[model samples]
Target: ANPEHYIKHPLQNRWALWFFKNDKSKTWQANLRLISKFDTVEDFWALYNHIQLSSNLMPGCDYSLFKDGIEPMWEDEKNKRGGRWLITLNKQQRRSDLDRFWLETLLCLIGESFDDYSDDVCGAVVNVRAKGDKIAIWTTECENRDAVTHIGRVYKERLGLPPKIVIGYQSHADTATKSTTKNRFVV
Candidate 1:
């Protein structure tokens, strides 16, 4: 039988891909471009492995994987009410940890690892930066403490981080309005 004849497991929702690389001449929205959307495990891997490693991305660049119909921008209708569980990685950890962390985040998204709270997930991002690399899992409702907290807990565990190491959830509204805010929730 041809490999193409086999059935593939599909995700409940198709995902959209986006990339952001800040260029002085380009508008912010122009810098954020969609790559493609996929809903199957096999197709996701094909895309993931072919893309540039997160560590290899130029500083100030980001790669975002979001559910189809949802824009990765903070202001999107699906994202306006949501927040992110942020993971900050040091510059030195880029080589040893960046790829691993990103792969795990992708797996968690595709696998729908958050159980009942998975529906709350909107997307995730990997930002390559000179100050520090950051990984964020965005959700659709920051005020849904139950779903939001559960997602953050599962996310941190999925990434295999130490229990003592905390990840904070910050609403896009908060992030957009101010340079800082205390975490609404952390896990």
Candidate 2:
């Protein structure tokens, strides 16, 4: 063990952490900044501990971790054709469930807990608001029902979600236009 002082558990792909805050003085693009990028377990921890927890962010703020090369915006080509498995939390759950759920999502991403479906994952976002909190794992394609559902099921299980509540998946295209788009898939 002494021979490997720098040894680390390496993740499969590069991940970039981005943070967004609502500041009237700053433009939308400027508000969202890349905080760091990492491919090793220790680096991920370093970045994770360096920032504020999702539950502590101000309303209208978001934390997104995307595979490197993909922007955390819907306009990005990768995200343009993707959708997300959205999990909405109650206002009261911020203190009890928000941080745990958020950390697990990041663990799942780095661990590739979805098996083959991990390749379809684009990124994840955590939004903290006064009304409610949201956590979603964005997938590369909604039409790929098999992979999408697998991702959702596995995500829910890892989040230790109760069977009583259902989580929904919504395509980006549908979410952008009036947000109707009923839940494309639920698990």
Candidate 3:
């Protein structure tokens, strides 16, 4: 069969890839740019292969795959009331798990791995830093315990993280404020 003969698998929703580089001379918004938007399995791989892996990105750079029209910022209306399930990886894990973890997160989004709660998923971000790297899956609402917890469990399992490892969900509101905020849920 010709490669073009196969039907292209459509994702549940369109996703936009964003790139951020921390430049002291530029404002945060200026450093962030939309790399591309994808809506199919084939397109997702195309974009993924065209970009640098998470591990290869320089420190202070970030890669975010967010739902179309949803800015990867706490201020976006879609994200204003939402939170994220945060996974903090030590510096050493960057060499071993960073790329795998990031790719799996992308597959989860495109595959709608969260099942019924896939709608709650806003996007995912991977921040590469000198001190430590962090990956997070942002959700539409932190108060929806059922959906949040379900998504967290599924995401944790998909990442194949050990039972001893704990990931926390933190609301955008709490994260924005300087005040200490508790983790709403952990898995």
Candidate 4:
């Protein structure tokens, strides 16, 4: 029925798209919904094209992409001991950079761009806030210095962030316990 050389380019991993809106009346998890799961390039593109761009989301909303079976919440089994490499963008940059950075992050996940440390990556999140926007890639283990560092470096390089920019890797343990957490590593 279709006329294309690439029918379904299967990805290495099945990924899930999650959308969260901070609703005061509901439980935390209740406010978050799993939009869909896809395992092929065409399916991913189809979902991306149909969803609202991160730049246009209402303040306090978030978009997260993670392994198909893993919940995006920090308490999820796979994310329980994880940390995230965070890229903070100022309010002014949302219009200019937010969408591109989020897309690049998605590409990295779908393509498994990290060399030997690809398995360490659990997922990524883009938080749209009135004050500023944040993009963070969550990795499975904060204690794996080698894999964590390599992941951070590869992520930074692939995103085309200049050396002048420094992103911090923060543990979910500390983050879940406090409003501000110490950086486990910064690269």
lDDT, candidates in the order shown: 0.88, 0.91, 0.93, 0.93
Instruction: For residues 1-187, write the lDDT of model 3, one tens digit per residue.
Output: 8767897888889999999999999999899999999999899989998989999999999999999989999889889999999988999999999999999998888888998999999999999999999999999988999999999999999999999888899998999895346799999
- In model 1, which residue pairs have backbone atoms overlapping below 3 Å? none
The better candidate by lDDT, 1 or 2, is 2
Give one digit per residue, the lDDT tens place, for model 4 in 74-156: 99888889899999999889989899999999999999999779898999999999989999999999999999999999889
For residue 30, what is the lDDT in candidate 4?
95
Q: Per-residue lDDT for 147 in model 4?
A: 91
Summing lDDT over every window of 10 consecutive residues in candidate 4, give the lowest-scoring window: 1-10
Alpha-carbon lDDT of model 4: 0.93
Off by over 4 Å in 4: 1-6
Give the lDDT of residue 137 in candidate 2. Answer: 96
lDDT per residue for candidate 1 within 1-187, as digits (tens), equals 8777898878777988899998989888889999988988888888887889988888999999999998899889999988999888998889878889988998888888999899889999999999989899999998999999888888888788998798899988899887466699988
Best-first order by lDDT = 4, 3, 2, 1
Which regions of candidate 3 deviate over 4 angstroms?
1-6, 179-181
For all the candidates, what are their Cα RMSDs to the real structure? 1.9, 1.6, 2.0, 1.9
Error of 2 at 65 (Å): 0.3
Cα misplacement distance, residue 48 of candidate 4 (Å): 0.3
lDDT of 2 by residue, 1-187 (tens): 5747868878999999999999999888889999889999999999888888888788999999999999998889988888999989999999999999999999999999999999999899999999899999999988999999999999999999889989999999888887246888999
